[PDB]
Amino acid sequence: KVFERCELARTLKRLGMDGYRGISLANWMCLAKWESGYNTRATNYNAGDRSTDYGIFQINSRYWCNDGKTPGAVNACHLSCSALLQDNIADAVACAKRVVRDPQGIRAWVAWRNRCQNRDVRQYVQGCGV
Ligand code: NA
């Protein structure tokens, strides 16, 4: 599924993302926009290290979900990577929450540093009623 902006923002608020481990909803929105374009079925193979990024938050198979074909990988969210390609984003959000519980937080995603950090991210939630 490809979410519309405000539809996602309302969804993430209901799922308790606003202010999770210190991260405002507008930041999660900026992350999803730059990682996947709000697309749950997005995948990106990384040829360099044989890992894959899965779903709306482009969560990596080396550390967070199991896809069986990543060498030396762990499965910190305790999920098949498949779970992160559903239209329903409950499991993806729970895994995102797990990612940010590590010391790096939201900095775990290089896209967030490039595109979101120190920016005016208000635009991603404006007019959405959240
Ligand atoms: Na894994």
Side-chain angles (χ1 to χ4, degrees):
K1 150 180 202 195
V2 174
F3 281 79
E4 322 260 286
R5 194 172 53 94
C6 294
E7 180 202 5
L8 183 62
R10 289 187 296 269
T11 294
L12 301 175
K13 202 178 174 190
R14 189 174 322 110
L15 290 171
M17 297 284 257
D18 189 24
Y20 191 82
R21 295 284 290 174
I23 305 153
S24 64
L25 185 55
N27 278 290
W28 294 113
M29 289 289 298
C30 185
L31 177 70
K33 187 276 181 164
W34 291 107
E35 295 294 347
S36 60
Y38 314 131
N39 186 2
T40 61
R41 75 168 286 157
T43 55
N44 186 72
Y45 183 57
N46 305 296
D49 80 330
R50 297 210 181 272
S51 73
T52 300
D53 302 317
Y54 293 88
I56 194 152
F57 295 122
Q58 290 289 279
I59 283 154
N60 197 266
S61 59
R62 186 159 296 286
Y63 307 106
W64 313 105
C65 60
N66 185 45
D67 64 4
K69 57 165 182 207
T70 303
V74 293
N75 179 10
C77 295
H78 315 126
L79 295 163
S80 165
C81 290
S82 188
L84 307 181
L85 315 173
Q86 307 177 71
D87 282 359
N88 179 329
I89 65 184
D91 299 324
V93 162
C95 189
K97 282 184 183 177
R98 170 69 192 80
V99 177
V100 299
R101 288 208 287 273
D102 274 6
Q104 280 197 280
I106 189 79
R107 277 161 171 80
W109 287 276
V110 81
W112 182 89
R113 293 184 216 155
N114 303 335
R115 307 286 185 166
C116 305
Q117 176 188 167
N118 306 143
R119 311 257 186 171
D120 188 10
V121 295
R122 285 180 300 190
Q123 46 161 286
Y124 299 101
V125 299
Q126 78 182 165
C128 295
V130 298

